[PDB]
Amino acid sequence: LLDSPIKVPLLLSEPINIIDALEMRDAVEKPQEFTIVAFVKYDKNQDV
Amino acid sequence: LSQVYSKVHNGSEILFSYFQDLVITLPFELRKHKLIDVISMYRELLKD
Amino acid sequence: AGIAASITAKGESKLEVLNFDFQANAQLSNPKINPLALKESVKFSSKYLRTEHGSEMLFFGNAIEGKSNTVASLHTEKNTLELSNGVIVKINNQLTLDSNTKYFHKLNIPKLDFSSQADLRNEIKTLLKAGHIAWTSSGKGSWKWACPRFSDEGTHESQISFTIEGPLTSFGLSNKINSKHLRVNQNLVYESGSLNFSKLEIQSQVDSQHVGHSVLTAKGMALFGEGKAEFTGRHDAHLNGKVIGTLKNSLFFSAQPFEITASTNNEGNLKVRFPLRLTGKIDFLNNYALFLSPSAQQASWQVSARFNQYKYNQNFSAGNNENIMEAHVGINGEANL
Numbered sequence: 530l531l532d533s534p535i536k537v538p539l540l541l542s543e544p545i546n547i548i549d550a551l552e553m554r555d556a557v558e559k560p561q562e563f564t565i566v567a568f569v570k571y572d573k574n575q576d577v
Numbered sequence: 578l579s580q581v582y583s584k585v586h587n588g589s590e591i592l593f594s595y596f597q598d599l600v601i602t603l604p605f606e607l608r609k610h611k612l613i614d615v616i617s618m619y620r621e622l623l624k625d
Numbered sequence: 626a627g628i629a630a631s632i633t634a635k636g637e638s639k640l641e642v643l644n645f646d647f648q649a650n651a652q653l654s655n656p657k658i659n660p661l662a663l664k665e666s667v668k669f670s671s672k673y674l675r676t677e678h679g680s681e682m683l684f685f686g687n688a689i690e691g692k693s694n695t696v697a698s699l700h701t702e703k704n705t706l707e708l709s710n711g712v713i714v715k716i717n718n719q720l721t722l723d724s725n726t727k728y729f730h731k732l733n734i735p736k737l738d739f740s741s742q743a744d745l746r747n748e749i750k751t752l753l754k755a756g757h758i759a760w761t762s763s764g765k766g767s768w769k770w771a772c773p774r775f776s777d778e779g780t781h782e783s784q785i786s787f788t789i790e791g792p793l794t795s796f797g798l799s800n801k802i803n804s805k806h807l808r809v810n811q812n813l814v815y816e817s818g819s820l821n822f823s824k825l826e827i828q829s830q831v832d833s834q835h836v837g838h839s840v841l842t843a844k845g846m847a848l849f850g851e852g853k854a855e856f857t858g859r860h861d862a863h864l865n866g867k868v869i870g871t872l873k874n875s876l877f878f879s880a881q882p883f884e885i886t887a888s889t890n891n892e893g894n895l896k897v898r899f900p901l902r903l904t905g906k907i908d909f910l911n912n913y914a915l916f917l918s919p920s921a922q923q924a925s926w927q928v929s930a931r932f933n934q935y936k937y938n939q940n941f942s943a944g945n946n947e948n949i950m951e952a953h954v955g956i957n958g959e960a961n962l
Contacts, residue, residue, distance in 0.1 A: 532604050539671055540642055549602040550639035557606060 531561050586623055593620065626655045646670035660685045674699055689716040704732035720753040741770040758789030779804030792819035808832035823847040825856070837865030843876070854880035870895035870907075889913035906933045921946050934961045 532555040534547035548555065555561070593616045600612050630651040637644050648668040655661050661684040668677055676697035683690045691714040699706035707729040714722045728745035745766040752759040764783030770776065779802065786797030793816070800811040812828035825845030832838060845856040858876025870893065877888035895907040910929040916922065923944035930937045940955035 536638055536643055537636055537645075539645065540673060543599075543640065543643075545640060546599065546602045547639055547643075548604055553604070555604045 532559070582623075586620075589623055590620065626653075628653045642671060642673040644671060673701075687717060691715070703734055704730060706730045722749065722751050724749050737773065739770070739772045741772075743768045756790070758787070760787040761785060777805060779807075793817070806834070820849050822849065835866050837863040837869075839863065852880070852882060854878070864895070867898050868895060869898070883919050885915070885917040887913065887915040906931070923951075935959065 632649040634647040664681040666679045678695040680693035694711045696709040709727045712724045726747040731742045733740040767780040769778040782801045788795040798813040809831045814826040817823040829841040839862040841860045843858045860874045862872040872893045875890040891911040897905040908931045925942040928939040937958035944951035
């Protein structure tokens with residue numbers, strides 16, 4: 530259920546499934562991988 | 578009536594083929610066959 | 626004071642159409658003595674669609690210069706669409722603008738042997754000044770396509786001339802269009818100087834093989850203060866095809882101080898080819914003549930309407946004179962049974 534395609538719809542209709550383009554044979558027991566990494570920083574000169 | 582129903586059935590068959598093509602090219606647990614059978618029964622219902 | 630804002634967003638997957646390549650940049654500059662410069666450029670690239678924009682605004686006090694272009698282009702197997710716009714605006718003492726717009730498409734659907742193409746240039750040049758207006762544009766475009774249900778080709782040319790200076794208005798319209806089946810020229814001229822006169826002139830010339838020809842010409846000269854009106858109204862229509870005949874309309878008059886005369890003349894000889902080889906014989910004479918004076922007046926109206934085998938003449942003529950009063954009614958009509 531968690532292996533469904535994820536995309537932003539510029540074109541809503543998919544001529545080929547993203548999984549099909551990925552060529553996987555995903556099963557229920559296959560651990561799908563997701564990792565989000567975000568960094569944010571605001572810089573103030575210590576030279577006052 | 579026969580001609581109109583034939584045209585509508587042709588359109589429905591095109592849609593069914595497209596949907597089946599999408600279903601086959603997607604990961605699934607056990608429901609591919611169920612959907613295909615539902616579509617076939619729908620075609621028979623259309624003919625009736 | 627300046628701010629640098631740059632963006633690079635890249636969402637990647639398969640189905641290249643689904644892959645976009647976005648970039649946006651923004652730069653601002655502002656010294657204490659307030660000449661301001663602003664610039665922008667935004668880019669996205671996905672196989673399905675690509676549109677590009679760049680705008681750079683400058684503000685040197687009284688002097689402001691605006692440049693901004695945007696061009697989009699669609700690319701698919703059946704068709705490739707192309708739209709481009711460039712805008713140049715500058716404001717120092719007058720407000721003059723130009724905005725060019727090129728459109729293009731080339732759509733081809735070989736499933737039914739269909740090909741369509743159209744290039745349109747839609748450009749505006751406009752100048753604004755206190756006491757003067759200079760506006761004009763050229764609606765230039767052409768077309769072509771060959772489809773079993775529909776096939777056409779031709780060129781369209783529209784020019785719009787407008788201008789203001791002092792208390793006189795100048796406006797010139799002239800449309801010239803050519804097509805395989807329809808050919809027509811439409812010139813229109815108008816001018817009126819303050820509260821002095823009014824010049825109206827019409828030039829319509831329509832060309833049609835199936836219908837025949839039709840000519841409309843008419844001209845207007847009205848002078849104010851003295852209350853003179855003198856417009857010349859004429860027209861000739863040749864009818865060909867299912868309806869064959871001639872329609873002529875002469876419209877003459879002269880409105881003058883204490884004198885007004887109207888001459889209307891509508892004439893038509895029409896033979897309409899109905900289904901089953903039945904012809905309607907329409908022939909009518911509708912003729913009018915009027916005169917007006919403070920002491921005497923007259924009105925005459927005469928109709929001679931005839932259909933197929935039924936003919937009807939209706940005669941009426943009234944004349945006001947101190948010597949004699951005219952009052953007669955002439956009614957005559959025959960209907961074969």
